[PDB]
Symmetry: C5
């Protein structure tokens, strides 16, 4: 639409993706969930698991709201993430950079609510030695902001799903849990929340 | 051409490649098809198939049409895709990033019709356990827009091609079917169409 | 010299590297040749050949001429290819991205004649099954413009060279031939020329 | 933050990340320490060690201090390192480029103190031949500025931390020391300091 | 605060694509390779994997500065992307160079530039002799890709093998370096190169 150009133009001049959109005495709440799609491989020598997963990330950016009457037909837009502030969520125990599989686009509606749903493949340090047993091997995937504490970035978890897990895999799921925690570090007196996805899996047969 | 040089000039000042060129509540229709070239490898252990294929993609961008009377002998132009809006089609079940092998340019005519034909190598999740049997392995290669629903981006299919299939590969191409679906998801009120290419193949000998 | 700087400044102000420098119905002729340097490897299981080769491309860009008067001591200059229009030659049957080994600069002279001479490593689809036989394996390295038909870009060949081929390779060269063909594709009305280099090689011992 | 937008804007407008924040007769002091997280692998044939570690770098950049009265609510911010001057620290005996695993953001406070804490995977040259003996292999990970001598960049160490060392790898930690040295080089009139992290480890029984 | 204004002048009044020659006089660049480690050899495919240090230096007359105008500035550390740098190609490389160090060069007030990258690269080489007393010999050949000798005068400095790792499986037999120059049938001007040569063999 013609308004669409107008909207994106405003994004270039009148917005900074480096600025965390906190609002006085209020952190930015980001919602986070992980859906495991496939355990690609394990390395029992190097203690690594290779996984493909779908992240669901959402938050409100008050700077990203616009007036519907000003851009009539425009309700939500598809935006390159590079143009937007994005939570600096890090995989604490990853041992490779993430490979993002999908278009690096996010949805933004007129209230400034952003959803970023990337599919990702990444390797993680894990004790995978129990993988050929009945109890399986348990890998914890730990995520959290690298630089923002809880009063600036309130990480919350959404309910996760094993429904997307590939059925014809050589690994079967014995269990999964997802939990939010909040721990202090020696440096700063503010805590840093984390969301941990724990998967227990074993070889079929 | 010199009267071809001004045409490109209009691209920069006016046009935004982030903006899907929907007209007045009419979706952008993209015609989509795949030519299979070579099945490079399968991974029986990790359930992966590695393919090389061309995507034929075409659509009309009404922001990209020009008065042919105003520009003498310019019937069409070759434009870098980074200067153009392109459909954010993703391979839903890919486990690797697409490796684009060809120059990243699209053909645009004065109707604003755009043609983009990349050659791609990509690895997909697939049950390849039957590959050595007479019935062989059947892989679904499923594509759709990552962020746009059918009212915005209407994905339609054209005839798939296999004439370009390599005849000296170790895999015999049994068959290939293509189908379009228009499905609602639990998340949104709008359907998101997909085109799926089903490839049945098996080891020769 | 202190005129190169003015010469380069003119490039930015007026020149568009996406515009193909055609004239009054005249296509840009580009002279093309490939020199085979080394056959790196073969994959007999996946039907792939890995080659390092030197491409020679030359053409005249009528927008890149300058009067030697207004730039006294400037015979020729070395320009980043990103500042120039360059032919979008693709290896039709590659199955990997080209790895350009050398600096990405072309030479341009006062009459707008441009020379671009990259050294490249790339993997191609090829029936290498006869490699250990007397007959050997034959591979076709096929190159052409990805988006410009024969009336826009006239691809012509020049003499081929094997003097540059490594003598200590495990692969013995037998024959190298080149030819120019003009052929039709489903997408398009007009013919697209190609130059194909045919390599026949075999193991020693 | 209304005041954060101002601060980030001022960074772009009135700061050059290419300039080392040395003062009038005074070097920049950078504090540096390496925390070993996991020895991923060793190659006894090529003499390499593959390690994952967490670096702590901090220094004061006097051009990054700000008056709190001009930015009332703002005590510290997370800034992309690309926007900052950062110490050009290189691993002397590295044989691969660093794979930075974490978000490339540093914390800056109002007195210009910067903290950058990347997680890194990187391969180093090392005599790993004693890895299966009781004594173990000893690897030196040596770091220093690549272009700045001690009078412009003063490199100092901090207390080490092996409390993050993965307990379930096939390698056990024997000895781990860290020392600062100030070597001279035949070229330059000026000495160049280095920090060296020495790991002794062996294969578990 | 003075380096600040140096970098500012560099932005408006300098094009890094322009070779800093003068009135009919080439830019001389000095070049030397120091071998650090032979990482591996491929005996089937005829390839050697090496890690080395390149010393490159030259004078860019556009990069000199009045020492009066900037009091306490001896040398500055500058991103190579902001400077003209020689387009030196490895003629017989079979992979892209992997640069291991920060991409910065030193420039002083005379406009002398020093660029010292450390690099991992793979080259075509006959390594069939690597297990013999005489050993394998590999040539590492470097030269400008687009500038003839009357524009870019490549000259060589003495190499260095003191930086060579003592604990690899390869002992060094012999090392040498030489400057060369030839006319190519194609072009009117001659072109120079510097070739570094190693001879090495497995230990034990
Ligand atoms: C980054 N770090 C904290 C950093 C911090 O506050 C700090 C630490 C040390 C000194 C000064 C500040 C903030 C919250 C995330 C946490 C991550 C964890 O450290 C870590 C380090 C290395 C590997 C895995 C995980
Ligand atoms: C790509 N195609 C033509 C298509 C075009 O004009 C084009 C190219 C790129 C972008 C937009 C349009 C141009 C010349 C190369 C040729 C290759 C052949 O079609 C082909 C593709 C797939 C299977 C068999 C044959
Ligand atoms: C992204 N998703 C649709 C739904 C949506 O955006 C969404 C989903 C859930 C919540 C909010 C939005 C949009 C169209 C593509 C589709 C893909 C599929 O989800 C999917 C997820 C994970 C792996 C493979 C495929
Ligand atoms: C680079 N060199 C010093 C000297 C300098 O910059 C230099 C040398 C010679 C000429 C111009 C500048 C600066 C501090 C680091 C030191 C590193 C060591 O050389 C070295 C060389 C090769 C591999 C590993 C280490
Ligand atoms: C690149 N080439 C010359 C090329 C030139 O000026 C030229 C050639 C042909 C036409 C017009 C100009 C310039 C100086 C270096 C020389 C290198 C060697 O060719 C070569 C080719 C392929 C692999 C390794 C080496
Ligand atoms: C950030 N702004 C600025 C302003 C002025 O409020 C406006 O009119 C629209 C936007 C905006 C642009 C793009 C997106 Br996505 C969200 C908000
Ligand atoms: C899993 N974690 C999180 C924790 C415990 O908070 C921490 O500080 C370090 C790691 C960690 C362990 C191993 C590797 Br490899 C990376 C991170
Ligand atoms: C978008 N425009 C604008 C205008 C003014 O209508 C015109 O004359 C031409 C173009 C245009 C520019 C590049 C391409 Br490709 C297509 C159309
Ligand atoms: C094949 N698909 C598409 C579908 C059915 O839409 C879906 O919801 C998820 C996948 C899919 C399968 C495997 C992997 Br790995 C990733 C996505
Ligand atoms: C872009 N032009 C055009 C014009 C106006 O003739 C001129 O002054 C010089 C050039 C030019 C710039 C760079 C190169 Br290389 C060649 C010609
Ligand atoms: C070998 N060719 C050239 C041809 C016939 O022109 C074409 O259009 C496609 C291919 C080709 C075949 C297999 C693979 Br994998 C890639 C390209
Ligand atoms: C670099 N400046 C300039 C100035 C004018 O002093 C100011 O007000 C704030 C900053 C500054 C901006 C961002 C960061 Br982080 C640190 C200091
Ligand atoms: C670790 N160093 C630094 C030192 C000792 O100053 C030197 O001269 C060379 C090296 C070095 C070691 C291995 C490799 Br690979 C590269 C450089
Ligand atoms: C580009 N110049 C020339 C000039 C304008 O005369 C001057 O005053 C200083 C510089 C210059 C800038 C950066 C570096 Br490094 C070297 C010289
Ligand atoms: C090393 N050279 C340079 C030389 C001798 O001038 C030539 O003509 C070809 C090569 C060369 C040899 C092997 C490979 Br692979 C690439 C280039
Ligand atoms: C995450 C978020 O902000 N969503 C809220 C939701 O809780 C609320 O009920 C709804 C209508 O106000 O939309 C908004
Ligand atoms: C204008 C608009 O749709 N506002 C929405 C709200 O209704 C929704 O609940 C929220 C999270 O989905 O995103 C915002
Ligand atoms: C897709 C589209 O909108 N255009 C079609 C095109 O297939 C056809 O070639 C042309 C004939 O004039 O018009 C119609
Ligand atoms: C202006 C022009 O050249 N006409 C055709 C148009 O009819 C066709 O639909 C389109 C897609 O093929 O390409 C163009
Ligand atoms: C392609 C081209 O235009 N080159 C010709 C070339 O054959 C000739 O030898 C030379 C004479 O000036 O230049 C002209
Ligand atoms: C006047 C002039 O430079 N003509 C040249 C000619 O020497 C050659 O045919 C080719 C290579 O430069 O391009 C043109
Ligand atoms: C205003 C302010 O907080 N300044 C701090 C200082 O207190 C602290 O010693 C240093 C290291 O964390 O960082 C800076
Ligand atoms: C040197 C610097 O900038 N910061 C120091 C900080 O590290 C220290 O803990 C404290 C004094 O005790 O504040 C100051
Ligand atoms: C090569 C170069 O440009 N630099 C030289 C340097 O070798 C010499 O030491 C110096 C003596 O002042 O003169 C200058
Ligand atoms: C003013 C100044 O320091 N000029 C130096 C010169 O003395 C030195 O020989 C050369 C590096 O060799 O760099 C330049």
């Amino acid at each position: 639409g013609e308004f669409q150009r107008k909207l994106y133009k405003e994004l270039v001049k009148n917005y900074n993706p480096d600025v965390i959109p906190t609002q006085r005495d209020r952190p930015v709440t980001v919602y986070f969930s992980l859906s495991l799609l496939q355990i690609m491989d394990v390395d029992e020598k190097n203690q690594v698991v290779d996984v493909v997963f779908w992240l669901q990330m959402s938050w409100t950016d008050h700077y990203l709201q616009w007036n519907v009457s000003e851009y009539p037909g425009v309700k939500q837009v598809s935006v390159p993430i590079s143009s937007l502030w994005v939570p600096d969520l890090a995989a604490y125990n990853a041992i490779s950079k993430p490979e993002v599989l999908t278009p690096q686009l996010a949805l933004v509606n007129s209230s400034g609510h952003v959803q970023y749903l990337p599919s990702i493949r990444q390797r993680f340090s894990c004790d995978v030695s129990g993988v050929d047993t009945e109890s399986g091997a348990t890998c914890k995937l730990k995520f959290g902001s690298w630089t923002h504490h809880s009063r600036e970035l309130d990480l919350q978890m959404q309910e996760a799903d094993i429904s997307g897990y590939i059925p014809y895999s050589r690994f079967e799921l014995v269990g999964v849990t997802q939990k939010r925690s909040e721990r202090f570090y020696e440096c700063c007196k503010e805590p840093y929340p984390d969301v941990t996805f724990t998967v227990t899996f074993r070889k079929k047969g």
